Every structure is written in C-alpha cells, then in structure tokens.
Amino acid sequence: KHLPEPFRIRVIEPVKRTTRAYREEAIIKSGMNPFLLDSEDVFIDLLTDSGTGAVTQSMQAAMMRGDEAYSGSRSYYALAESVKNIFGYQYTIPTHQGRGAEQIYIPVLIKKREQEKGLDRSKMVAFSNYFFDTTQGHSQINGCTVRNVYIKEAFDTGVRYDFKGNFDLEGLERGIEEVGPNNVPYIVATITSNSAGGQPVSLANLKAMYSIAKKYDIPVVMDSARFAENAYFIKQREAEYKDWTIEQITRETYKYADMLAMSAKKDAMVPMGGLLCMKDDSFFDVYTECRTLCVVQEGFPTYGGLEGGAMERLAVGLYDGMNLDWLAYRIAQVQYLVDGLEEIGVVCQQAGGHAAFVDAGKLLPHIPADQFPAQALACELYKVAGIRAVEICPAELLRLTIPRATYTQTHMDFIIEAFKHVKENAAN
Template identity: 45%
Template sequence: MELPYSEPYKIKMVETIKRSTKEERLKWIKQANYNLFNLASEKVFIDLLTDSGTGAMSDKQWAEMMIGDESYAGSSSFKKLKKTVKKITGFNYFLPTHQGRAAENVLFSAMVKEGDIVPGNSHFDTTKGHIEFRKATAVDCTIDEAFDTSNMHPFKGNIDVHKLETVFKKYPKDKIPFVILTITCNSAGGQPVSVENTKAVSKLCKQYGIPLYFDAARFSENAYFIKKREEGYADKTIKEIVKEVFSYGDGMTMSAKKDGLVNMGGFIALNNKAVYKQATVFNIMFEGFITYGGMNGRDMGALAVGLDESTEFNYLESRIEQVAFLGKKLVEYGVPVQQPFGGHAIFLDANKFVPSIPRDEYRAQALAIELYIVGGIRGVEIGTVLADRDPFTRKNRYPELELVRLAIPRRTYTNNHIAYVAATLKNIYDSRDEAKSGYVIVDEAPIMRHFTAKFSKI
C-alpha cells in the first residue's frame, strides 16, 4: 500500500482563531461594504484571501530573526541574502525591496515609459497596475487552454509564442521594454510554465532583442510542477530546475512573501549592469539604501533561509498536495474549479458555479461574499472587479474567467481546516440555484479598485 504524503514538520506553536455566527457575519460584511479586504482578521475563521506573507516560518528562520544585523549600510544579513539569491537564481546583481510590488515599482520606473507595450502571461494585478500607471499597456499572450477550466493541459501558464511574435511584429522594438513571464501564473489559476515554453520565449526574445524578466513570486512551486509533469526533469532537484529556468532570462522581481516563506520582503535580481545602476537610483528614492531596501536585517536573514527551504522537494510536495487535497474534495462534490489544480490556490469557476448572476453584477465577488457569510471563509475575487476598467474607455473589462481564489497559506492550516472549506462550498453549490443577483460598485479607486471598492447588494 502506498503511504500518503505527510507534512515534513511538526507544530511548535498555535494561534487561536474565533468562530462566529452567520448572523454576525451578515452584519460584518455589510459594515465592510461587501469588500472582503475590509474585514478585520478576527472576524474571519479561515483566511484564504492570500498566500502572500500569511505563512508560518520555520525554527531556523526564527533563529535568524534573533541574529539579524540592523546596520544601515553593509549589513551582514544583506550579504547572506545576496549570496543565497546568487546561489539559487544565478543572477549577478541584487536589490532588496520591502515587497514584490515595490520591486515592480523600482524596476518599472527604470524601464517602462508612456506608450510602451509589455507582453506577458496574464499579468498579476499589481504588475498590470504599475504598467498602466505609467500609461503603458499590458498585453496578455497566455495560451488559449488557460481559459478553459476543464482542460487538463499541464502548463496552462505558458505563453503562446505565436501571440507573442505578433506583438513583436506589430510594435517597434523600442516600445517593448521587456516581456514578463509570471511563474506560476496566478491570474490563470496558479498555473505553471514549462521549461520548454520558457526556452521558446527566451529564444524569440533574443531573436528580437527584447529582454525577458520573470515575476518569480512562486518560482519554486513552478519548479515542482516541472519536476512532476515535464519529460526529462523527474530526476532533477528543485534547485537544479530553478537555476535552469532563470538562466533563460535577464532578471526577475520577487515577492518574497510567497516562495520566500517570510511575512514581508522582496527583491530584484538582474544580469544587466546598466539596468541595475538605473534601478539603484529608484531603490534609494523609494525603498532605502541598496543594502537594506526597506527590509530589516532580521527579515533578510529569515528570507535567506526561506529561499533554501522553499526549494526543497519535501516541503513543496507537502504544500502542493494540501492544495490538491482541497481540489480533489471539491471535484468529488461536483464543484467547478480550475484544473489541473494550481500550486498555491484552488480557483472556483464562478461562470459555471453561479451563471444565473449577471457578469455586470460581479458574480465571482458575489460567490466570495457568500462563502464568507456561510462559513466565515475569506477568499478573493479574480474576475471583473480585479480586471478593473479600461484606462482609456473607463468601461469594465470582462476577463474570460470569473474566478474566486482560495489561496492556502504555507504551513498554516491542517487538512481538517481544508475539509471544512470543502464542506462549506458543497453546501453553497447544492443551493446555487437560489443565487439570482449580485452586487453593484458604489465607490472605487481609479486603479486597482478591488482593494478598496465599496459594493451594495442588488
């Protein structure tokens, strides 16, 4: 008999979470203007809003917190992190930032200008936000299979090379500062990108003289899928796969709050010295001196350990198998989800779950709210609300997929918690025919509205 996977750690400390009643949650979500971001954490039972910075650190990471060097310049913790980043990614130049969107802000300030075109694979919300804030345009070149949640393509995060070349041919080279490849592709459902596709994209970029950068927040989870799904990689270590993937690019931004296994932090890693010198100017302006960049020394030390831990197979197998545990339960219950299951989250297909709610009434947001009301579970909408308005027409953009993301924090919840989430969703799905109407936005920010928008129930 094959033994099931088991977590490669034991629990040393616990945190109390509070149960609440449905009546309390109805009151709280109304007070929050039906925006799950506005809920106080103590009003949430199981928090799957994001896997960003919400995981548990290891004993070795906490040990690093005690010996962090908080020197303003030349910190030994910085040197430790720089050495680790070089060892794992292979990139020669390194700038710490306080989180991933800060890394984007610094790099894009150096490279993106008004009128530019930035192709990629379903850009993440902050990535697109930073591009559009600079009056540039993000162009999605993801393969079509990514938009069919029942299609079992193993690498739905892949870029369609023909779509990408069409962009290269349509616009002059000086209008395309870089291609950004997100690994794994969050907006497509936490879907991985293959080495074969990365190599093909890299080859095309070199042919046209355009740099290739990675949004690498979940790079180690991406490497796990390569090991499990791509021919020729089963016997390679995660660290070997990671090193190869990054060898095809010119640089990366990193939200260390994901596969860095820390609560706060990020960085930029590069091979181009000229871009590095430009970026240092903005890093000092926006983040801090180049040897701390908005991070404490203790956090840099914890991140150095986290990067090593997250690129070990046993950790990744436990983490991704827990995500799959939720996915398998939901499939067993008939609940429509993006398949194959992603690395960090399960994505509910709201188009199939509640098709009776009109798209202009934000059906994925309505489903996410219902999940909170029924079970005290907080997820997040990845659909029309997040897609925001077209910056030129100011009309809603309707993406092909309307998703609710259930992001699983790393090393945080047990499978009993996950089973509770699945059972709650089964109950909601069994009564889905009762869902007839959704919500209307009554107040929103001009960009990245999903964080602070206010809704009213129709």
C-alpha cells in the same frame, strides 16, 4: 490523498469562532465585500497566500541575527549570496516586497530603451505570459500598455494541460513585430502564471521565449513569487527533468531571463520581503540605475525597505521554500481541496500551485451577468462558515488561496462541507 505534513507544528496562533448571527452583521458592515472584514471575524482566511503563511524554525532564528546597518550590512550580503547560489544572479537589491521591485524596474527599463533605441513612450507595449495586477498597474502608471500572450488552453477550466502558464510563442513573436522591437521595453515571464490560477510554465517554453527576446534584445524580467512551485511542476510533468532537484531546475530555469522581480511573501515564505536581481555584467548598468531609484522609493539598496532580520530570514526562506517534501505537501493540499470540490459538482480550474479557483459563474448561473457572481458566493461562503475569499468576459472565478503550512486537511474538509451547504442552497 492529503499528504502528511513533513513537519512538526511548533507555534500556533489561536483563533475564536463566531455566531451565524454575528457574521451577517460583519458582512453588511464591511458592506458585501469580504475584502474589508476584520481579521478576528475570520476563522479560515483565504484572502491570499501573500505573507500569510508559516515560517520554519530556522527562519525564525534568522530574524534574531540582523545587522541593522544602514549601508553594507552583512545581512545584505547573506541575502545576495542566497540569490547567487540559487539563481546564479550576480546582482541583488532587496526590496520590501513585489509591489515595489516593479516600481523600480519598470521606469528604468523604459528609460533605457528610450535612450539606447528610441523607444516611443506613446507607442510602447510590454509583454508577458500573463501580467499580475500590480505588474500591470505599475506598467500603466508609467504609461506602458500591456498584452498577455497566453496559450488558448490557459483559462478554459473545462480542459487539462501540463503547462497552462506558457507563453504563446507565435503571439509573442508577432506582437513584438506589429509593435516594433524598439518600443517593447521588457517581457515579463510569470512563474507560475498567477492569474490563470498558478498554472506552471515549462523549461522548454522559457528557453524558446528567451530565444525571441534575445533575437530582439528585449530585457526579460522573471516575475518569481512562485518560482519554487513552478520548479515542482516541471519536475513532476516535464519528461526531461523528472530526476532533477528543485534547485537544479531553478538554476536551469533562470538562465532564461536577464533579471528577476519577486514578492518573497509567497514561495519563499516570508511575512515580508522582495527582490530585484540581475544575472550578470551585461545588466550592471540597469542594476546601477535601479539602485538610484531604490534610494528614492524603498531606502538605501543595501536594505531597500527591509530590516536586518528580514534579510537574514529571506536568505533562508529561499532555501526552505524549495524543499521537495514541502512542495509535494503544499501542492497536494491545494490539489486535495480542488479534488474535494470537483467531487460535489463545484467546477474548478485545474489545480495550480497555491490556490483553488472555483468557477462561480457556473455554480450560480441564475445569479445574473452584472451582479458579480463570485462576490455573491464569497459573501455566502463567509456567512455560512467564517471563510474569507475574494475574486480579484475572461472568467469570474472565486479564489480560495491557501497560506502555506497554515491550515490542515480538517480545514480543507471544512471548506468542502461549507461549499456543499452553499451549493445545496444556491437557488438563492
């Protein structure tokens, strides 16, 4: 059951269709890699949910009230105030997006422990329930090795579990020790756990993760692109919070980190925006230090690469993103897609918040090892219906990512029928 949209549609961007002849030539042209296809050659564009979604009327309003002031803008304060009421975090630095909160927090947090505890850079390891590609990429650019301490269940697309994104507690505790605490610059808590497919992390797990971090005085950065979807799964699956509001769960949730880095272009539903925030005074020093570096990289920490409107809009998106009907609707669409695909013998991970991971390796096991299974299917899937999706042994899963409030159930049915044509011609 696809829930009815708890909204009226208001502004649409028209899309043209393409001949089968035409997409063949597009797919060679951007040579066997959907990633480099032209937007206009794509009907249903599932490359990513990042910044590709609808906004609300209020968000659109918000864009028209920007204070474009270089230092100390009222729009900066409007944004910082949303962060205060939602996460209860006293310190806000806007950034243009995630890719860029990371470029700041990471060198600061390494320098910090370096000064205060003799972190040895050649020996430093950071931890996460699972590092996102950018978070990882940037950790390594700063010379920091990373380890994922996820739970045995997480990538096993064959079995179901309520919070597959959780931290392996034994593993994190032992990692920290084998490495030494002085050389762990930070732990990142990814909610939802993006890389296992948007698999959520429960409150009980976050609390216990934070007890360990506390015991060794390791900063905890909450990677919050999909903070709202995570809350919804907690409301839906964790017995103790069944009656909590999403806001209430967010506030409890964020007690178990020291700071947050967020690409706003996901759950907070903005075409553009990011946040790097600190909870309290204990981190004022880090906040000061991240301000300096934000200057160099984004621009003055009162806009941090955002125009006025963007800050006004984000200040509103953080609310609209947490709407209960909204989440229930968004999450069920994904769930409906996945259900739809399981029902025709296309094996998928457990449905997460924002995307449907098809185990491409299983759909075409005759298409061999080192011939990139998903890529091949993704190419075919584009060839048949004008559907763009990408994939980037753990698991090679093709990744149907759903922009928020963008496509309808008819589109979901459309992805389904296409897959049925692919599967039913997969002997190639």
